[PDB]
Fold this sequence. Notes:
The PDB classes it as de novo protein. By secondary structure, this protein is mainly alpha-helical. The chain has a domain of about 80 residues. It contains 13 helices and no strands.
Amino acid sequence: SDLAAKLAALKAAIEAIIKRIEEAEKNGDEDKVKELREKLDKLRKAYDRLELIIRLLEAALKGQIEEVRRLLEQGADANGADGTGTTPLHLAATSGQLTIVEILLRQGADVNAADNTGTTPLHLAAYSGHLEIVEVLLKHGADVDASDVFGYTPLHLAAYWGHLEIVEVLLKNGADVNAMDSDGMTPLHLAAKWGYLEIVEVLLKHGADVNAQDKFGKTPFDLAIDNGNEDIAEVLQKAA
């Protein structure tokens, strides 16, 4: 998209300098030719590097394990990012490509790479329900409480999307059970809103603040009432 436009722009710059190199040797200007030939070489190397990153993103996303191995053997940058800061490890973590995750981390891929909105691979694996990827990222030093620009932690995302085992694994890795997003919402607020009873129970058992108030004065209890979650409203009134 923005990588395609950037690759087509290198294509264009390379063809333009070639025309200039030829006018110049043909005009007999030796020094301009050598200067332009040095630039040409840098542009070609930058074209090749970018074309490998485009292919590595696509291969990681589509779970093509051998194509990922090929591209890395050819020199593809394991840390290369698209124009939103998305890396191969982001795409692998989202689409559940465990072997590709492990292969990228062996190449020195940043396990904590933040895209332009502060989203890390661990956020995406938590969102997307990929438990074994959550585990492998944490084993390799993923920040359990990384905060995106909205203030969401992986635990917020696991609570929001109803992934119970991922909630358990994140709390076992020291996730702050009472982390607050930019609206003051806690994981318990999200689990109560979306009706995830089992997650509500796990959060309470790990010290979730039943009295926590978002930026609108709402407790979890309140969101359970507003959203018709009767059982959850019951457990929250009891704990209060």
